[PDB]
Amino acid sequence: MRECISIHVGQAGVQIGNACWELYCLEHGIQPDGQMPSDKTIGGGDDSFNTFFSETGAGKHVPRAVFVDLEPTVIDEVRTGTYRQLFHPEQLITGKEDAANNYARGHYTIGKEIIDLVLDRIRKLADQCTGLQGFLVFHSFGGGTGSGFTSLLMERLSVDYGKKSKLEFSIYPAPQVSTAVVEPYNSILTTHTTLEHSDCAFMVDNEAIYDICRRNLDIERPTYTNLNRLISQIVSSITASLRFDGALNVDLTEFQTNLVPYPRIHFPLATYAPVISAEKAYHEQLSVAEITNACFEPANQMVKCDPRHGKYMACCLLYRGDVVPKDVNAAIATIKTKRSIQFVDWCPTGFKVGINYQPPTVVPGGDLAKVQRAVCMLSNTTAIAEAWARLDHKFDLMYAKRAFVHWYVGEGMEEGEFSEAREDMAALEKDYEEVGVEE
Amino acid sequence: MEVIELNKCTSGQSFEVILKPPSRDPSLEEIQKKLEAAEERRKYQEAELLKHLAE
Amino acid sequence: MREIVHIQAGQCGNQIGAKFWEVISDEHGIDPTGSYHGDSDLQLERINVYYNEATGNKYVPRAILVDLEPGTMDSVRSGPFGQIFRPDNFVFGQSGAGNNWAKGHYTEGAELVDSVLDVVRKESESCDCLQGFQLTHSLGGGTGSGMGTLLISKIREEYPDRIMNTFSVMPSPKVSDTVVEPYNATLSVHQLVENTDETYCIDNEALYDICFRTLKLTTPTYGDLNHLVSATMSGVTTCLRFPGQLNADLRKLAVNMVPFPRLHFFMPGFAPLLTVPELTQQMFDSKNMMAACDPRHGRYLTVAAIFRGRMSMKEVDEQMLNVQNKNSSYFVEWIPNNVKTAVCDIPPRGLKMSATFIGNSTAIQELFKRISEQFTAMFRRKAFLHWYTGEGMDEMEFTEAESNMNDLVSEYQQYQDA
Amino acid sequence: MYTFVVRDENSSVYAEVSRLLLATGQWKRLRKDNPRFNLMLGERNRLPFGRLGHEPGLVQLVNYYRGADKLCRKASLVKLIKTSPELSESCTWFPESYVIYPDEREVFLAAYNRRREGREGNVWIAKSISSEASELLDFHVIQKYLEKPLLLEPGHRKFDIRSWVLVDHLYNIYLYREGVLRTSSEPYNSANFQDKTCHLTNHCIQKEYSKNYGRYEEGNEMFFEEFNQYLMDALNTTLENSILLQIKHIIRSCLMCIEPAISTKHLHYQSFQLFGFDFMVDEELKVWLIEVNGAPACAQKLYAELCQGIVDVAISSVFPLAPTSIFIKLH
Ligand SMILES: Nc1nc2c(ncn2[C@@H]2O[C@H](COP(=O)(O)OP(=O)(O)OP(=O)(O)O)[C@@H](O)[C@H]2O)c(=O)[nH]1
Ligand SMILES: N#CCCNc1nonc1-c1nc2ccccc2n1CC(=O)c1ccc(N)cc1
Ligand SMILES: Nc1nc2c(ncn2[C@@H]2O[C@H](COP(=O)(O)OP(=O)(O)O)[C@@H](O)[C@H]2O)c(=O)[nH]1
Ligand SMILES: Nc1ncnc2c1ncn2[C@@H]1O[C@H](COP(=O)(O)OP(=O)(O)O)[C@@H](O)[C@H]1O
Ligand SMILES: [Ca+2]
Ligand SMILES: [Ca+2]
Ligand SMILES: [Ca+2]
Ligand SMILES: [Cl-]
Ligand SMILES: [Mg+2]
Ligand SMILES: [Mg+2]
Ligand SMILES: [Mg+2]
């Protein structure tokens, strides 16, 4: 058994962390007080759920998690929330003055003041691990803390834990879901500095989640609670193999092995199905073929793009519920004849499949209905570079006039870092192109 | 359409389906340097401000 | 960041300041005695931004009242919510500023400014995490203009890493007290370009026209003018006082609205002076601007629209997209998504629903150009200069201030053609 | 008020379509780099499809199908037909073609000797016209040359047919009822392949090189009414029966083949596109597909009608403004 430590940075990271650990406790049958009746080995054990939860003498299951934000009000909600007993005080770290949507403020100014405290608190969780796998980092691209402090943390983690793997769950900025005007700046800056420190990163575009909540859940104006509960489901699907007994993606290293052939191209596309509103009285359960077919519909992706105009490097199918290998193959065979699935001519055109018989758990009184079978597809496709293209375009527009740059320079940053970050993104876009090549 | 590496347990199973065959991190020192370099630039600009206000 | 320190200076500053506190005290459910009697808990969630809590469930405004003569501040104490203010935070002299910038900035005000900073220091020392400061004043007089900018300068020296915010009243011949107002305003704006992060430009000319050509008031008083400002000040600071979508602070406001440090002068707007399209079209109209400027003569760098009350925000976004397409040529292309739409659940008193406009437009150069012309008209003949030279100033300082604002006009003109 | 942008100044077709939208008064033209548009009349090359459909509350439509280049490029088209099960090698309306990089180098010669030895007419054409395989490879795709084309009288001249096809956002296939014949005014001689004047029907080469240009019909353009009349008088048949059936068949075959690849039925943005199909007819009244044009120009006579049609079925269908059809619905 090898442990996994989760780190949640900024408002987005923390609030998503809340939704995930709420779901984890429901999936593993852990009560808000930390008591887990189904667990019989009191005080320890090396079960699969011990990868995320440590144990105390009182039969209390404590999340191997650390919440960090440069401002107290968000994490203070955790200190008083439903799962307040779940976390030890040292796991929750707060400042007094945030990064004001400024990467420079989060990375340099406020960052250095609290970075050493965070590492020591993380070190304490690490010392309780017999064999640490690595880290799961949750943060936003746009936020000053989620971009600024995260990139600083990723650097120090690579120093103090050079052998361990690091995975990201990153929130891509969407103007419709409460953004700062300088979020394109923060996104490019944090990506450039984190790029060589992340082995695998799952991007989640707020735009995609927002539309899915409107289209499939009939929520006219989705809140963060609506968005996070959906995101937690996708997150849960990805981390299920680490928390439950299985053979596929059993450790953090396997994610890199199965999804990321080239180190820089480590942003797999995630697609989830099905998403059904709980308010829907009469619902007909979708089959294996139907939910598998939906994995190739752009309206179900975590990032809006067209995989038909790219090339696959790897594909992983994560099923939960009433699913058997026979029905999976029959579904794939049908899909390969209807859909446009082109792989790179240096990779095996295939699908690695994982099935967990336990159907998806839903939050009581939530927006999602309980289904009998669901699937999350992880596919490393060059099509996701579209997201980089539009993000870099917004960057270029503002930076041409050097708008808002003074806010960053005023925090000790230099104009050179802006251009330095952009060129790396230019190289990153170019890397995707090399792979997925009147009248 | 081949099915390889089928692993069955009591919580589920996993396998692989082949359809078509193929055809120097920065040190702690250097990070401290960058963080302190930006701090000096902040202190410099603040000093320039206080000098200006002194005038 | 949490606490904000409020400061009001001079007659106009203290009169609009008092009105601002009367309005927001009502919205937060605080009576003139300082006791809370509200029904909702949204009123108390972020009340510590503007209020200190004294023992006995009493909320005392973190406000400091400054003037060089007791006249206006005496009226404030005898006003409606006059007893809610901390008595030790009344700092005043007896001389007055005689509508003279130099008196407030150099002679009379310099003598009093230290005791003001003492009160500022005391309030700041007992803050959990000071955001910064908000100043209310006019630019046409002597105290609020001269001493107000002197105060800002010395506050920045003692707190170089905190945000400075001003609600500044621009003078106008339509509502004028003295002829030296262009001199006082010109000297003050130069201070503002260097020492504030955010300035809400409140033009008395616009306030008069709104009272005249819209509210149909034959003879508008200062009370009528201040009614518009109170409503505006409540609207623009809503995202600071209440839990909402934005949930912002002073620094986050400045970061998103100010693409270039010197260009931080905003055109506020309010509606109504009701249907959502009516509410949306009206807020983007020149007749609702608190700064007498034509937005169609300049370009918007950033825009913030805040809606209050209960309404279909679906219908709002449709109308927001609607007004944007009408005014598509009045926005800049080099700042993506420069228009912010926000909502607050708490409606103002007397209104079922409202909307507040906060625009960073280049069209505001018309305000500074207007002041510059009136300045030069007198200065070319050195008229009324003796009031200032008798206080120690010389002509060179005027020439500098004249140049600096001209430069400011030029800077706005640069980004209007880009 | 709908908003659109113009990013192709060279497009004569969409210059007219742009003019029509403004004349309605309900469409406003923004600057080319303004992203807050309803309709993009995009550029021919490197159209940023990845930036479309990401503006809040904005339904966006573009006048090009991402992936349509597979049909509008010579090498891709040949590759598409030979590899698609829907089209297959059993494609009896597309000339025997081979893709050549300066591949199908061995197969072309393998079939070349199967015609020379059999004494069958072994003349080929290559672009991006000789009877010798050596002269071609020394000189891109190689296509079989119809040595027995349909010749118009009087004049003893060959021609080609242009069909305008519109595919909307719902992937409905509309064939413009008005086509055009581009004719080479010089009489066809089999023997001379050096002089391409009688053998090229293309207007650009025809406009200047044809020593008898504009002799029979103005601008060397014959429209559907006359060509139908000629077919009735000369060959006792109709344009519909002898030719148009095969044309509608070929168009439908090509467009349905790439539908799952380019469709935008569930995409975050929408696409439509005007296509230019070029056909050839042999002496057996059989139709052959020559090429597919991505950005076709219309005939001067037919500009007003088609461009108005484009607005009604492709643009107004998505963005409604405040009756016979000029199109034939093929889908
Ligand atoms: N899905 C989701 N996105 C969020 C959430 N909270 C914030 N975001 C996104 O994160 C971006 C802003 O980053 P934040 O996390 O709010 O800011 P921060 O990381 O705390 O850094 P600061 O600037 O110091 O506040 C915006 O684009 C939001 O859309 C959340 O709870 N769920
Ligand atoms: N959503 C969310 C939170 C982050 N956005 C910001 N936080 O404060 N202001 C923000 C922000 N983002 C923007 C994007 C475009 C234009 C203006 C924008 N603003 C500024 C803004 O919203 C505001 C609101 C009230 C004001 N009195 C002044 C400014
Ligand atoms: N809007 C508004 N403007 C005022 C008010 N009182 C004075 N002013 C303006 O402020 C300028 C005079 O400055 P004032 O504040 O009276 O002098 P001070 O005491 O030295 O600051 C003139 O241009 C007036 O038009 C008021 O109550 N409301
Ligand atoms: N298989 C063929 N047989 C006879 N003529 C042909 C054939 N293919 C093309 N042509 C002639 O070539 C001309 C256009 O050829 P095309 O390949 O479209 O040129 P380009 O590639 O320069 O557009 C037409 O006038 C047509 O008559
Ligand atoms: Ca146990
Ligand atoms: Ca590493
Ligand atoms: Ca004295
Ligand atoms: Cl290690
Ligand atoms: Mg935050
Ligand atoms: Mg006075
Ligand atoms: Mg007076």
Side-chain angles (χ1 to χ4, degrees), chain C residues 80-101:
Chain C
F81 284 70
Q83 304 296 333
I84 206 181
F85 298 107
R86 192 171 190 264
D88 285 21
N89 292 16
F90 286 77
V91 185
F92 58 89
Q94 308 291 344
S95 295
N99 290 286
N100 189 284
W101 193 83

PDB file of all heavy atoms in Angstrom, chain C residues 80-101:
ATOM      1  N   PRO C  80     -29.089  63.229  11.429  1.00  0.00           N
ATOM      2  CA  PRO C  80     -29.801  61.977  11.711  1.00  0.00           C
ATOM      3  C   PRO C  80     -28.926  60.945  12.418  1.00  0.00           C
ATOM      4  O   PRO C  80     -29.172  60.623  13.582  1.00  0.00           O
ATOM      5  CB  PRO C  80     -30.179  61.473  10.315  1.00  0.00           C
ATOM      6  CG  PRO C  80     -30.281  62.707   9.493  1.00  0.00           C
ATOM      7  CD  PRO C  80     -29.213  63.625  10.015  1.00  0.00           C
ATOM      8  N   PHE C  81     -27.916  60.438  11.720  1.00  0.00           N
ATOM      9  CA  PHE C  81     -27.017  59.438  12.285  1.00  0.00           C
ATOM     10  C   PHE C  81     -25.761  60.083  12.861  1.00  0.00           C
ATOM     11  O   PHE C  81     -24.676  59.511  12.794  1.00  0.00           O
ATOM     12  CB  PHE C  81     -26.629  58.409  11.220  1.00  0.00           C
ATOM     13  CG  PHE C  81     -27.709  57.409  10.915  1.00  0.00           C
ATOM     14  CD1 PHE C  81     -28.860  57.791  10.243  1.00  0.00           C
ATOM     15  CD2 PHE C  81     -27.567  56.083  11.289  1.00  0.00           C
ATOM     16  CE1 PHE C  81     -29.853  56.871   9.960  1.00  0.00           C
ATOM     17  CE2 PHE C  81     -28.556  55.158  11.008  1.00  0.00           C
ATOM     18  CZ  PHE C  81     -29.700  55.552  10.343  1.00  0.00           C
ATOM     19  N   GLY C  82     -25.915  61.273  13.432  1.00  0.00           N
ATOM     20  CA  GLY C  82     -24.782  62.026  13.936  1.00  0.00           C
ATOM     21  C   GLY C  82     -24.154  61.457  15.193  1.00  0.00           C
ATOM     22  O   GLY C  82     -22.994  61.737  15.497  1.00  0.00           O
ATOM     23  N   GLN C  83     -24.917  60.653  15.926  1.00  0.00           N
ATOM     24  CA  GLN C  83     -24.450  60.112  17.197  1.00  0.00           C
ATOM     25  C   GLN C  83     -23.710  58.787  17.030  1.00  0.00           C
ATOM     26  O   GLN C  83     -23.107  58.284  17.977  1.00  0.00           O
ATOM     27  CB  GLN C  83     -25.623  59.938  18.166  1.00  0.00           C
ATOM     28  CG  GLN C  83     -26.425  61.210  18.408  1.00  0.00           C
ATOM     29  CD  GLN C  83     -25.610  62.302  19.075  1.00  0.00           C
ATOM     30  OE1 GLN C  83     -24.650  62.027  19.795  1.00  0.00           O
ATOM     31  NE2 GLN C  83     -25.990  63.553  18.836  1.00  0.00           N
ATOM     32  N   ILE C  84     -23.752  58.228  15.825  1.00  0.00           N
ATOM     33  CA  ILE C  84     -23.145  56.924  15.575  1.00  0.00           C
ATOM     34  C   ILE C  84     -21.625  57.019  15.441  1.00  0.00           C
ATOM     35  O   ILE C  84     -20.917  56.023  15.591  1.00  0.00           O
ATOM     36  CB  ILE C  84     -23.738  56.249  14.316  1.00  0.00           C
ATOM     37  CG1 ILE C  84     -23.603  54.728  14.404  1.00  0.00           C
ATOM     38  CG2 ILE C  84     -23.081  56.780  13.049  1.00  0.00           C
ATOM     39  CD1 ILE C  84     -24.140  54.002  13.194  1.00  0.00           C
ATOM     40  N   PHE C  85     -21.126  58.221  15.173  1.00  0.00           N
ATOM     41  CA  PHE C  85     -19.698  58.411  14.946  1.00  0.00           C
ATOM     42  C   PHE C  85     -18.914  58.501  16.250  1.00  0.00           C
ATOM     43  O   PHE C  85     -19.385  59.075  17.232  1.00  0.00           O
ATOM     44  CB  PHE C  85     -19.448  59.659  14.099  1.00  0.00           C
ATOM     45  CG  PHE C  85     -20.057  59.592  12.730  1.00  0.00           C
ATOM     46  CD1 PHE C  85     -21.172  60.350  12.414  1.00  0.00           C
ATOM     47  CD2 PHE C  85     -19.511  58.772  11.754  1.00  0.00           C
ATOM     48  CE1 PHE C  85     -21.733  60.291  11.152  1.00  0.00           C
ATOM     49  CE2 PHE C  85     -20.068  58.707  10.492  1.00  0.00           C
ATOM     50  CZ  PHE C  85     -21.181  59.468  10.190  1.00  0.00           C
ATOM     51  N   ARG C  86     -17.716  57.927  16.247  1.00  0.00           N
ATOM     52  CA  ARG C  86     -16.824  57.996  17.395  1.00  0.00           C
ATOM     53  C   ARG C  86     -16.356  59.434  17.598  1.00  0.00           C
ATOM     54  O   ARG C  86     -15.711  60.008  16.720  1.00  0.00           O
ATOM     55  CB  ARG C  86     -15.626  57.067  17.189  1.00  0.00           C
ATOM     56  CG  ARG C  86     -14.781  56.842  18.431  1.00  0.00           C
ATOM     57  CD  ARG C  86     -13.751  55.749  18.195  1.00  0.00           C
ATOM     58  NE  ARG C  86     -13.085  55.346  19.430  1.00  0.00           N
ATOM     59  CZ  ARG C  86     -11.917  55.826  19.842  1.00  0.00           C
ATOM     60  NH1 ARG C  86     -11.276  56.730  19.114  1.00  0.00           N
ATOM     61  NH2 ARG C  86     -11.389  55.400  20.981  1.00  0.00           N
ATOM     62  N   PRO C  87     -16.689  60.022  18.759  1.00  0.00           N
ATOM     63  CA  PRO C  87     -16.396  61.424  19.080  1.00  0.00           C
ATOM     64  C   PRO C  87     -14.915  61.774  18.955  1.00  0.00           C
ATOM     65  O   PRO C  87     -14.581  62.908  18.612  1.00  0.00           O
ATOM     66  CB  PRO C  87     -16.844  61.546  20.540  1.00  0.00           C
ATOM     67  CG  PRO C  87     -17.883  60.494  20.699  1.00  0.00           C
ATOM     68  CD  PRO C  87     -17.425  59.351  19.846  1.00  0.00           C
ATOM     69  N   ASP C  88     -14.043  60.809  19.224  1.00  0.00           N
ATOM     70  CA  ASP C  88     -12.605  61.035  19.130  1.00  0.00           C
ATOM     71  C   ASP C  88     -12.137  61.133  17.682  1.00  0.00           C
ATOM     72  O   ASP C  88     -11.015  61.561  17.414  1.00  0.00           O
ATOM     73  CB  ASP C  88     -11.839  59.926  19.852  1.00  0.00           C
ATOM     74  CG  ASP C  88     -11.900  60.060  21.360  1.00  0.00           C
ATOM     75  OD1 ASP C  88     -12.823  60.735  21.863  1.00  0.00           O
ATOM     76  OD2 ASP C  88     -11.025  59.488  22.041  1.00  0.00           O
ATOM     77  N   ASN C  89     -12.999  60.734  16.751  1.00  0.00           N
ATOM     78  CA  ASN C  89     -12.655  60.765  15.334  1.00  0.00           C
ATOM     79  C   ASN C  89     -13.122  62.038  14.634  1.00  0.00           C
ATOM     80  O   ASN C  89     -13.125  62.119  13.405  1.00  0.00           O
ATOM     81  CB  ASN C  89     -13.187  59.522  14.620  1.00  0.00           C
ATOM     82  CG  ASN C  89     -12.479  58.254  15.059  1.00  0.00           C
ATOM     83  OD1 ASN C  89     -11.809  58.231  16.092  1.00  0.00           O
ATOM     84  ND2 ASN C  89     -12.624  57.193  14.275  1.00  0.00           N
ATOM     85  N   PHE C  90     -13.520  63.028  15.426  1.00  0.00           N
ATOM     86  CA  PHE C  90     -13.830  64.353  14.908  1.00  0.00           C
ATOM     87  C   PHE C  90     -12.603  65.246  15.052  1.00  0.00           C
ATOM     88  O   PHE C  90     -12.305  65.729  16.144  1.00  0.00           O
ATOM     89  CB  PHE C  90     -15.005  64.973  15.668  1.00  0.00           C
ATOM     90  CG  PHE C  90     -16.344  64.382  15.317  1.00  0.00           C
ATOM     91  CD1 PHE C  90     -16.724  63.147  15.812  1.00  0.00           C
ATOM     92  CD2 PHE C  90     -17.231  65.077  14.509  1.00  0.00           C
ATOM     93  CE1 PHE C  90     -17.958  62.607  15.497  1.00  0.00           C
ATOM     94  CE2 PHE C  90     -18.467  64.543  14.191  1.00  0.00           C
ATOM     95  CZ  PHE C  90     -18.830  63.307  14.686  1.00  0.00           C
ATOM     96  N   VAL C  91     -11.886  65.457  13.953  1.00  0.00           N
ATOM     97  CA  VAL C  91     -10.690  66.292  13.976  1.00  0.00           C
ATOM     98  C   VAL C  91     -10.910  67.576  13.184  1.00  0.00           C
ATOM     99  O   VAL C  91     -11.090  67.538  11.967  1.00  0.00           O
ATOM    100  CB  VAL C  91      -9.476  65.546  13.398  1.00  0.00           C
ATOM    101  CG1 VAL C  91      -8.219  66.385  13.553  1.00  0.00           C
ATOM    102  CG2 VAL C  91      -9.310  64.203  14.080  1.00  0.00           C
ATOM    103  N   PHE C  92     -10.892  68.712  13.874  1.00  0.00           N
ATOM    104  CA  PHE C  92     -11.173  69.985  13.220  1.00  0.00           C
ATOM    105  C   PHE C  92     -10.358  71.161  13.753  1.00  0.00           C
ATOM    106  O   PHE C  92      -9.866  71.136  14.880  1.00  0.00           O
ATOM    107  CB  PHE C  92     -12.669  70.308  13.295  1.00  0.00           C
ATOM    108  CG  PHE C  92     -13.205  70.381  14.697  1.00  0.00           C
ATOM    109  CD1 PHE C  92     -13.183  71.574  15.402  1.00  0.00           C
ATOM    110  CD2 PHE C  92     -13.738  69.258  15.309  1.00  0.00           C
ATOM    111  CE1 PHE C  92     -13.676  71.643  16.691  1.00  0.00           C
ATOM    112  CE2 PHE C  92     -14.233  69.321  16.597  1.00  0.00           C
ATOM    113  CZ  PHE C  92     -14.203  70.515  17.288  1.00  0.00           C
ATOM    114  N   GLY C  93     -10.222  72.188  12.918  1.00  0.00           N
ATOM    115  CA  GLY C  93      -9.589  73.434  13.309  1.00  0.00           C
ATOM    116  C   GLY C  93     -10.617  74.549  13.347  1.00  0.00           C
ATOM    117  O   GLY C  93     -11.818  74.291  13.270  1.00  0.00           O
ATOM    118  N   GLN C  94     -10.154  75.791  13.454  1.00  0.00           N
ATOM    119  CA  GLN C  94     -11.063  76.926  13.578  1.00  0.00           C
ATOM    120  C   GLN C  94     -10.881  77.952  12.461  1.00  0.00           C
ATOM    121  O   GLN C  94     -11.745  78.800  12.243  1.00  0.00           O
ATOM    122  CB  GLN C  94     -10.887  77.608  14.938  1.00  0.00           C
ATOM    123  CG  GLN C  94     -10.975  76.669  16.135  1.00  0.00           C
ATOM    124  CD  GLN C  94     -12.372  76.117  16.360  1.00  0.00           C
ATOM    125  OE1 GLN C  94     -13.352  76.631  15.822  1.00  0.00           O
ATOM    126  NE2 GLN C  94     -12.466  75.064  17.163  1.00  0.00           N
ATOM    127  N   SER C  95      -9.760  77.869  11.756  1.00  0.00           N
ATOM    128  CA  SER C  95      -9.419  78.870  10.748  1.00  0.00           C
ATOM    129  C   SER C  95     -10.257  78.771   9.477  1.00  0.00           C
ATOM    130  O   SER C  95     -10.818  79.767   9.016  1.00  0.00           O
ATOM    131  CB  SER C  95      -7.932  78.785  10.396  1.00  0.00           C
ATOM    132  OG  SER C  95      -7.129  79.129  11.512  1.00  0.00           O
ATOM    133  N   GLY C  96     -10.337  77.573   8.910  1.00  0.00           N
ATOM    134  CA  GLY C  96     -10.969  77.393   7.618  1.00  0.00           C
ATOM    135  C   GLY C  96      -9.922  77.459   6.523  1.00  0.00           C
ATOM    136  O   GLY C  96      -8.772  77.812   6.780  1.00  0.00           O
ATOM    137  N   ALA C  97     -10.315  77.125   5.299  1.00  0.00           N
ATOM    138  CA  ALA C  97      -9.368  77.077   4.192  1.00  0.00           C
ATOM    139  C   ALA C  97      -9.624  78.165   3.150  1.00  0.00           C
ATOM    140  O   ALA C  97      -8.855  78.312   2.202  1.00  0.00           O
ATOM    141  CB  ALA C  97      -9.377  75.699   3.544  1.00  0.00           C
ATOM    142  N   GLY C  98     -10.707  78.916   3.335  1.00  0.00           N
ATOM    143  CA  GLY C  98     -11.059  80.015   2.448  1.00  0.00           C
ATOM    144  C   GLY C  98     -11.123  79.647   0.977  1.00  0.00           C
ATOM    145  O   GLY C  98     -10.739  80.444   0.118  1.00  0.00           O
ATOM    146  N   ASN C  99     -11.607  78.439   0.692  1.00  0.00           N
ATOM    147  CA  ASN C  99     -11.638  77.901  -0.668  1.00  0.00           C
ATOM    148  C   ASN C  99     -10.276  77.963  -1.353  1.00  0.00           C
ATOM    149  O   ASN C  99     -10.187  78.103  -2.573  1.00  0.00           O
ATOM    150  CB  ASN C  99     -12.699  78.606  -1.518  1.00  0.00           C
ATOM    151  CG  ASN C  99     -14.114  78.263  -1.087  1.00  0.00           C
ATOM    152  OD1 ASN C  99     -14.604  77.163  -1.345  1.00  0.00           O
ATOM    153  ND2 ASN C  99     -14.779  79.209  -0.434  1.00  0.00           N
ATOM    154  N   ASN C 100      -9.219  77.849  -0.556  1.00  0.00           N
ATOM    155  CA  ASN C 100      -7.858  77.978  -1.058  1.00  0.00           C
ATOM    156  C   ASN C 100      -7.063  76.683  -0.890  1.00  0.00           C
ATOM    157  O   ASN C 100      -6.832  76.229   0.231  1.00  0.00           O
ATOM    158  CB  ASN C 100      -7.153  79.138  -0.349  1.00  0.00           C
ATOM    159  CG  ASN C 100      -5.812  79.469  -0.964  1.00  0.00           C
ATOM    160  OD1 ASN C 100      -4.836  78.755  -0.761  1.00  0.00           O
ATOM    161  ND2 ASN C 100      -5.756  80.564  -1.711  1.00  0.00           N
ATOM    162  N   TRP C 101      -6.649  76.098  -2.011  1.00  0.00           N
ATOM    163  CA  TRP C 101      -5.906  74.839  -2.007  1.00  0.00           C
ATOM    164  C   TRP C 101      -4.633  74.938  -1.169  1.00  0.00           C
ATOM    165  O   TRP C 101      -4.331  74.046  -0.375  1.00  0.00           O
ATOM    166  CB  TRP C 101      -5.560  74.430  -3.440  1.00  0.00           C
ATOM    167  CG  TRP C 101      -5.084  73.014  -3.587  1.00  0.00           C
ATOM    168  CD1 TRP C 101      -5.861  71.897  -3.696  1.00  0.00           C
ATOM    169  CD2 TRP C 101      -3.724  72.566  -3.664  1.00  0.00           C
ATOM    170  NE1 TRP C 101      -5.069  70.779  -3.825  1.00  0.00           N
ATOM    171  CE2 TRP C 101      -3.754  71.163  -3.810  1.00  0.00           C
ATOM    172  CE3 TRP C 101      -2.484  73.213  -3.619  1.00  0.00           C
ATOM    173  CZ2 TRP C 101      -2.593  70.398  -3.910  1.00  0.00           C
ATOM    174  CZ3 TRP C 101      -1.333  72.450  -3.720  1.00  0.00           C
ATOM    175  CH2 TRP C 101      -1.396  71.058  -3.864  1.00  0.00           C
TER     176      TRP C 101
END
